[PDB]
Amino acid sequence: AREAKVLRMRFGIDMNTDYTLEEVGKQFDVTRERIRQIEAKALRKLRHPSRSEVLRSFLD
Amino acid sequence: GVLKIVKVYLAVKRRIQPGDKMAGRHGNKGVISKINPIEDMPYDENGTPV
Amino acid sequence: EFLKPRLVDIEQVSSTHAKVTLEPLERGFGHTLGNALRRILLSSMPGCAVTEVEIDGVLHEYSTKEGVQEDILEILLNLKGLAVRVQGKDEVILTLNKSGIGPVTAADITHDGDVEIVKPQHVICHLTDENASISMRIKVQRGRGYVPASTRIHSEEDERPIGRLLVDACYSPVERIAYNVEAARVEQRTDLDKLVIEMETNGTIDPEEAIRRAATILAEQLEAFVDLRDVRQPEVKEEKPEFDPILLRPVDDLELTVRSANCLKAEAIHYIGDLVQRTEVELLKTPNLGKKSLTEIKDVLASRGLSLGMRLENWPPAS
Amino acid sequence: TEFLKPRLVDIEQVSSTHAKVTLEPLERGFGHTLGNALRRILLSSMPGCA
Amino acid sequence: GPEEITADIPNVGEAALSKLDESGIVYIGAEVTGGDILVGKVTPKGETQL
């Protein structure tokens, strides 16, 4: 749920604007380099399969 | 508006298939409908298909 | 409670055509086997037939050779009709050369242990300028019936040799078959019939050889006509792939350098399912792989979405 | 060289006396050849006492 | 902007860029089918807004 809020946040996903990573840090109280790590692991997670299978196909 | 143009020239070889239109010189049109194996063809006692 | 036939005089009359006879034939079985054999003999008979051809300085059929009077397209059409026989082999690549103002027959080729040029008068083309000169890789496979140039690209998988000019394949040796059952009176027995099956060949099948493979197939077919088990297939295939299907593709797909291409050839890594799970730890240790050599693998793996070095407690399942 | 013998064959019989057999897939032209040949033998030369 | 005939094309495999020269044109003699690129070309559309 935090990796979702973190991802929906970095991108414009079902939200108006997208947020500067600092803007994001203050919003969770645990900040900085930190959120950028939470982010990367989440991407990292969505990157191989179980997960990877479906999204890949949108790329042509 | 046009800078340069590349024209590629293709040579297709079309055989023949159900649907092509054919005709003799006497106004007999007709469209080949099935293509038959030499096996199912009418032959004469000399064995030579048509 | 029955009789059975067999073959008396197989009378050749030319290299091209002969009239084989079948004598112990009961009532009307003359027409029974006679039609049904015409039907297997006109189709299902083996043949080797020229398939692909590379020629010297020629890119495709729609061109002309300098100093020859046929147009390439025609010249392939002369080869469709190039009769030949080969034995132990299943695709031989003959070779042709010759120069000088001279009609190039099917003779002027080069022999092989297996190659028989059943018609070396057969015209392939004509040269027309003293030092006009031609060479070619004629390729001859062997198969059954009609395999036209067109259907031959689905395997594709790089037939890039652009100078390779596939011709349609009329793989056959029957030209026309024509049986007649004239009644033959074996001295005693009411009336049994003869079966003079007359045929017409390209020269490359020996009549008796034929007629046997013919009955051969007739047998193999009926073989399941005897019993009738209502047989079926299991079917119901799987709707569950575990991993992402990319891991079943070959490493060519990574569109990478040659040096790195063979590296994964050699270290045993075809499927990317194995390249994925082999770390950088595994790779300096691998034959001919450096800082330039492996920097290469982390860029294509990056752009397709995957990574080097990972796991899957399950690789690869399961047919 | 190597040939094709069928798979799937539901002899769907009505009554004991009557029967309808379906049987695929045959090579091209092999339906008629086998069909007619087995018809001839089924019709003309089949041992019986009438 | 100007459109380029460059052999450089967005979202494409070497499988396509095989039948093509450096310059982006298919080589003469090359047997092609439906879909294959005869002349690689690109048109400028910058600042996408995805």
Q: Is E16 on the interface with B (CB under 8 A)?
A: no
All structural domains of chain A with their residue ranges: 1-60
Q: Which two tokens stand for residue D35?
A: 């069909």
Question: Cβ of C230 and D37 within 8 Å?
Answer: no
C237–chain D Cβ distance below 8 A for any pair: no
Residues 6+ apart with CB under 8 A from C59: C162, C163, E28, E29
- Report the distance separating Cα C120 and Cα C9, nearest Å: 29
Grouping H, G, I as helix, E, B as strand and the rest as coil, residue C214 is helix
Q: Which of C162, C253, C256 to mutate to test the interface with E (most CBs of E within 10 A)?
A: C162
- Is C314 within 8 Å of C304 (Cβ atoms)? no
Q: Which amino acid is at C30?
A: G
Please tell me what DSSP assigns to residue E15.
Answer: H
- A8 with A38: CB under 8 angstroms? no
- Bridge-based pairing of strands C196-201 and C17-20 is antiparallel
Determine if the peptide bond prior to C148 is cis (ω within 30°).
no
Domain segments of chain C as ranges: 1-46+172-225, 47-171, 257-319
Closest approach of C172 to chain D, Cα-based (Å): 12
Elucidated via? X-ray
Resolution (angstroms) equals 3.6
DSSP state of C90: S
Give dist(CA C199, CA A2) in Å, integer.
83
Say whether B46 and C38 touch across the interface (CB within 8 A): no
CB pairs under 8 A between C and D: 62
Is residue C283 within 8 A of residue C307, CB to CB? The reply is no
Put simply, whether C39 touches B (Cβ < 8 Å) is yes
Give the pair of three-digit tokens for residue C202: 């390209």
Gap from B8 CA to chain E (nearest CA, Å): 7
Question: 3-state DSSP: chain D helix, strand, coil percent, rounded to 5?
Answer: 30, 10, 65
Q: In 3-state terms, what secondary structure has residue C99?
A: strand
- H or E segment to which residue C140 belongs: strand C133-147
User: Does residue C316 have a cis bond before it (omega within 30 degrees)?
Assistant: yes
The domain made up of A1-60 is a member of CATH 3.40.50.1970: no
Packing angle, helices C29-41 and D30-43, rounded to 10: 170
Compute the residue count for chain B: 50
Q: What is the CATH number of domain C47-171?
A: 2.170.120.12
Non-local CB neighbours of C97 within 8 Å, separated by 6+ positions: C108, C110, C133, C134, C135, C136
Cβ within 8 Å, pair B6-E2: no
CATH number of C1-46+172-225: 3.30.1360.10
Residue whose tokens read 């038959």:
B36
Q: Show residues of chain C in contact with A45, CB under 8 Å.
A: none
Which residues make Cβ contacts (< 8 Å) with residue C111, sequence separation at least 6?
A: none
Residue type, B36: N
C296-302, long-range: CB within 8 Å, 24+ apart, which pairs?
C296/C256, C296/C257, C296/C260, C297/C254, C297/C256, C297/C260, C300/C254, C300/C255, C300/C256, C301/C254, C301/C275, C301/C276
Q: How many CA atoms lie within 13 A of C38 on its CB side?
A: 31
CATH number of C257-319: 1.10.150.20
Find the closest chain C residue to D22 by CA distance: C230
* Closest approach of E36 to chain C, Cα-based (Å): 13
For the beta carbon of residue E21, count every other beta carbon within 10 angstroms: 13
D19 close contact with C: CB closer than 8 A: no
What is the chain C residue with the closest CA to D10?
C230
